[PDB]
Amino acid sequence: MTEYKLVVVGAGGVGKSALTIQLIQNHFVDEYDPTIEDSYRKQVVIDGETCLLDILDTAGQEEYSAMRDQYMRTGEGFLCVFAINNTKSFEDIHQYREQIKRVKDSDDVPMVLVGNKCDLAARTVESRQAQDLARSYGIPYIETSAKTRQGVEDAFYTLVREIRQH
Ligand SMILES: Nc1nc2c(ncn2[C@@H]2O[C@H](COP(=O)(O)OP(=O)(O)NP(=O)(O)O)[C@@H](O)[C@H]2O)c(=O)[nH]1
Ligand SMILES: O[C@@H]1CO[C@@H]2OCC[C@@H]21
Ligand SMILES: O[C@@H]1CO[C@@H]2OCC[C@@H]21
Ligand SMILES: [Ca+2]
Ligand SMILES: [Ca+2]
Ligand SMILES: [Mg+2]
């Protein structure tokens, strides 16, 4: 079996769980229950390949983030998520990327930058800004809405396609 281990990281509240639950379970989580560490598994066909996705949904709240680094170690690719209406979460991305590089002991780790909540209009991070950040990291930028499902499959499948290039 072909298994891809994906890890979703980013600031508290950006929509990591809502994204993962939309992908796996096809509904939108409206309430906010902070995550400690949850895992999901699903068999899917991606570009003609039957594979198993193992997705680790991590804590964004500092308080709930005990041993996050330990969980992240096994990850093969990382979704670095911020929210387009949360400037601080975007500024935080650098820190999440650095943590990933530390945990993996590599500067060559498959990643995708994700700007979530694109259904909302209080945008404070413009597409071009996020494109520029992604470009500096050598990775794709994709916008998503866990609410409408826009971009969700694309974000996760793009991460698999990045893992395949490494
Ligand atoms: N409009 C809109 N709301 C969203 C979107 N994604 C998440 N939300 C909302 O944002 C809140 C937080 O989402 P959640 O997925 O719990 O965030 P998280 O990043 O997993 N948080 P934590 O790090 O604490 O576990 C919830 O109220 C959820 O409905 C989105 O794409 N659009
Ligand atoms: O800030 C609180 C916690 O995260 C949610 O994202 C939108 C605002 C809510
Ligand atoms: O119905 C729309 C799409 O899904 C969201 O759940 C709450 C209502 C929103
Ligand atoms: Ca719901
Ligand atoms: Ca290390
Ligand atoms: Mg969560």
Curated annotation (Swiss-Prot):
Membrane topology type, per the record?
Answer: Lipid-anchor
Per UniProt, the keywords (alphabetical) are: Acetylation, Cell membrane, Cytoplasm, Disease variant, Glycoprotein, Golgi apparatus, GTP-binding, Hydrolase, Isopeptide bond, Lipoprotein, Membrane, Methylation, Nucleotide-binding, Nucleus, Palmitate, Prenylation, Proto-oncogene, S-nitrosylation, Ubl conjugation
What species is this protein from? Answer: Homo sapiens (Human)
**Catalysed transformations (reactions):** GTP + H2O = GDP + phosphate + H(+)
Q: What is the effect of changing P34G?
A: No effect on interaction with PLCE1
EC number(s) recorded for this UniProt protein: 3.6.5.2
Sites carrying a glycan are T35
One GO biological process this protein is involved in is: regulation of actin cytoskeleton organization
Q: Which family does it belong to?
A: Belongs to the small GTPase superfamily. Ras family.
Name the organs or tissues of expression.
Answer: Widely expressed.
Where in this protein would one find the motif Effector region, according to its record?
Answer: 32-40
Activity-regulation annotation? Alternates between an inactive form bound to GDP and an active form bound to GTP. Activated by a guanine nucleotide-exchange factor (GEF) and inactivated by a GTPase-activating protein (GAP).
Q: Which CDD domains match?
A: H_N_K_Ras_like
Q: What is the effect of changing Q61K?
A: In NMTC2; somatic mutation; increases transformation of cultured cell lines
What is the recorded function of this protein according to its Swiss-Prot or TrEMBL entry?
Involved in the activation of Ras protein signal transduction. Ras proteins bind GDP/GTP and possess intrinsic GTPase activity.
**What happens on changing V29A?**
No effect on interaction with PLCE1
Q: How does it assemble?
A: In its GTP-bound form interacts with PLCE1. Interacts with TBC1D10C. Interacts with RGL3. Interacts with HSPD1. Found in a complex with at least BRAF, HRAS, MAP2K1, MAPK3 and RGS14. Interacts (active GTP-bound form) with RGS14 (via RBD 1 domain). Forms a signaling complex with RASGRP1 and DGKZ. Interacts with RASSF5. Interacts with PDE6D. Interacts with IKZF3. Interacts with RACK1. Interacts with PIK3CG; the interaction is required for membrane recruitment and beta-gamma G protein dimer-dependent activation of the PI3K gamma complex PIK3CG:PIK3R6. Interacts with RAPGEF2.
What's the protein here called?
A: GTPase HRas
Name a GO CC annotation attached to this entry: Golgi membrane
Positions of post-translational N-acetylthreonine modification: T2
